[PDB]
Amino acid sequence: MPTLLRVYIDGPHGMGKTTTTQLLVALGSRDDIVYVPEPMTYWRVLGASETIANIYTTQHRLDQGEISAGDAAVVMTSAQITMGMPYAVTDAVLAPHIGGEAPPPALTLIFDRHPIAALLCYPAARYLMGSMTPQAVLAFVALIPPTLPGTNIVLGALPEDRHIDRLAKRPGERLDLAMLAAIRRVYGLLANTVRYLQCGGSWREDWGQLSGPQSNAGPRPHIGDTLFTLFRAPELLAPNGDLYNVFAWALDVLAKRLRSMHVFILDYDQSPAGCRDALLQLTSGMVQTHVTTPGSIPTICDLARTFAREMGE
Amino acid sequence: KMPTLLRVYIDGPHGMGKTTTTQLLVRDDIVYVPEPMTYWRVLGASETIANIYTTQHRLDQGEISAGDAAVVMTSAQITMGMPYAVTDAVLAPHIGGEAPPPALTLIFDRHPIAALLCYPAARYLMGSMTPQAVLAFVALIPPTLPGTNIVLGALPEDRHIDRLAKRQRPGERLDLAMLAAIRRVYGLLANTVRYLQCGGSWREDWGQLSGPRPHIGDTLFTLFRAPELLAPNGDLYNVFAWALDVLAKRLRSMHVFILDYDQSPAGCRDALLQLTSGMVQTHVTTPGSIPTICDLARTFAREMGE
Ligand SMILES: C#Cc1cn([C@@H]2O[C@H](CO)[C@@H](O)[C@@H]2F)c(=O)[nH]c1=O
Ligand SMILES: C#Cc1cn([C@@H]2O[C@H](CO)[C@@H](O)[C@@H]2F)c(=O)[nH]c1=O
C-alpha cells in the first residue's frame, strides 16, 4: 500500500502556525503535499455570521459586566460548536481511508489545527476565562472523535513576551492577554497530558494528588501539570468530594483520545523560513499510516483541495 | 469466543410510553439505563428541560429573536446529549464484532442520535435552531458500532397527545407543534434508514428534491435543502454535503425496530421482548468487558436516573 503522512499544526493563535504551514507546503511539488487551512469562510459566513467577532465581543461584554456568566456561556458554547464543525466533518470523512501505522509518503497532509483545538483546547480556555461551564467543556470532550492512527500533532513553543508582541501586531479579534495566557496554559497542559499518558499515567490513581515544556520525551509530569487538573471544580464534585461518575467517564475518554497521539514541539521563536525548516526536520520522526484502498490517495487529495478552496481565505 | 452482548436502544418521540414500558421490562443479565434526568436537572446544568421549553415559548410569543433562541437551544442540546455521548465513548472499545444466549442485555432509554440529530432537527423545524448547528451535531455522531438496535415507536397522533399529556417531564410545556415536528423527524429517520439500506444514494437523488425505497423527499435529507446551506447557484456547500455523507454512513448500519405503543403497558413490554429475536448481538472484546459494562450501566442508572 502507499503511505500517508498527516501533520496537524496546532497551539495558541498568533504564533505563526498558518504561515509555517503554507511555507512547508510550498516546498513540495504541487501534489506530494496538500494544505488543509483554518476554515475561515465557515467561521465568518457559511457556519454563522462572524463567529470569531462574536467570541471576542462576548468575552469583552462579560469582562465589562454587561452580560452574565450564563448568557456568555450559551453564546460561547454555541459558537464553539460552529468553530469545530469543519474539523469534525473532515476527520469523519478521512477516517475510513486511514489504515494502520506503517520510505517517502505518497501523500502528506498538513492541517491547520486538529479537532481538539475547537473540541477541547478553546473550550477549556474559555472555562478559565469564565465564559464556559466545565460541564460544557466535558460535553465537548466526550464528542472528540476516535483518535486516528498516525495522528502527529505539532504544538508551539514561544516566550510569552514575544508571543504578546506578535499578537499585538500580527478578524473580529480583540486584544486579550488574559485569553492568551489561558490558551498558552491549556496547550502547555495538553503537551504534558499526552506525555503523562504515554509514561503510563493513570488519572484515577493520581486524582488524590490534585490540590490547587517540550514533549514526546522527558519524565512523567505531575497530574497537576496536565489537563486533568482543570476538572477539580465544585460543579463537578459530588457531596462525598469525588467527581460524579459521568464526569469521571469524560476524563477517561480524554485519556483514551490523547494517549495515542504523537506530539512534537516546534520553536516559533525564529523567522518564518526558520520555522519551516525546523518543521521539515521534525517530520522525519513522524508516524505514517497505510491507506485502506489504493484510490484513497487521490480521494484524500481531492477532499483536501475541495476543503481548502471552499473554506480557506 | 468472548461472551455476547445485546444492546437495545429505546428511542423515538417522547411521551409515547418509552420509560414505563422498559421499567416493566426489568434482573441480573439485563440492565436498564434510564434517562439521565438528574444530569438534565442538576449535574450538567439547572433544569435544562424547563430551559428548552421556556425558550421555545418565548420565541413563539415573539419575546426573543430566532437568533437568541438558537444559541440557547444549541447549548442546551449539548447538555442533553452529554451522558449519551460519554456512555457511548466508554462502551465503544468493549464492543466486538457481530455474533443463541446473550450473556448480557443492555436496554438504553434513547440512543445518542436523539440528542445529536432528532431533537436538533425538530427544533430546526420549530425555528429555534440553525441548520448549520444541526449538521455540527451530526458531524459528531459517534461511529455506528456493530449490533446497534434502535427501537422506534408507532402511535397515532391523537393517542400520542393523550399519552404526552400525562407524561410531561419537569419543566416541559405541552406543545403540539413540537410534538408534530418530533414525530415528523422520527418518521423521516425510519424512512432514511430504509432508503439507505435499500441502496439509496443522496447525491444521486439530490436533484429530485427541487421540482424500491422511499423517495428522498420523505427522508431526513429533505430537511437539509435549507437555503443557509446552499451556494448562490443552488449547490450544497461541500462542508455540508460531507456532513450528509456522514449522516448516511451512521444511519445505514443501524438496525431499526418498530414498537407499537397503542396498547397496554404490559403489552408494550411483551412486544419489546418479541422484537428482541431479530436484534443483532455482538461479542465483547475482553473477558472482563461484561462485568465492566454492567457496572457502567448500573452506576449511570443510580447517579443520573430519576
Ligand atoms: C479551531 C479553533 C478555534 C479558534 N479560535 C480563534 O480563532 C482565531 C483564528 O484561529 C483566533 O482568534 C483563535 F484561535 C477560537 O476562539 N476558538 C476555536 O475553537
Ligand atoms: C435525548 C434527548 C432529548 C430530550 N429532550 C426532551 O427531554 C424529555 C425526554 O424525556 C422530553 O421533554 C424531550 F424529549 C429534548 O428536548 N432534547 C433531547 O435531545
Curated annotation (Swiss-Prot), chain B:
It is an enzyme of class 2 (transferase). The active site is at E35. Substrate binds at Y53, Q77, R169. ATP binds at G12, P13, H14, G15, M16, G17, K18, T19, R163. Its EC number is 2.7.1.21. It catalyses: thymidine + ATP = dTMP + ADP + H(+). It holds the Pfam family Herpes_TK. GO terms for biological process: DNA biosynthetic process; TMP biosynthetic process. The keyword Aminoacyl-tRNA synthetase does not apply. Homodimer. Belongs to the herpesviridae thymidine kinase family. Catalyzes the transfer of the gamma-phospho group of ATP to thymidine to generate dTMP in the salvage pathway of pyrimidine synthesis. The dTMP serves as a substrate for DNA polymerase during viral DNA replication. Allows the virus to be reactivated and to grow in non-proliferative cells lacking a high concentration of phosphorylated nucleic acid precursors. This is Thymidine kinase. It comes from Human herpesvirus 1 (strain 17).
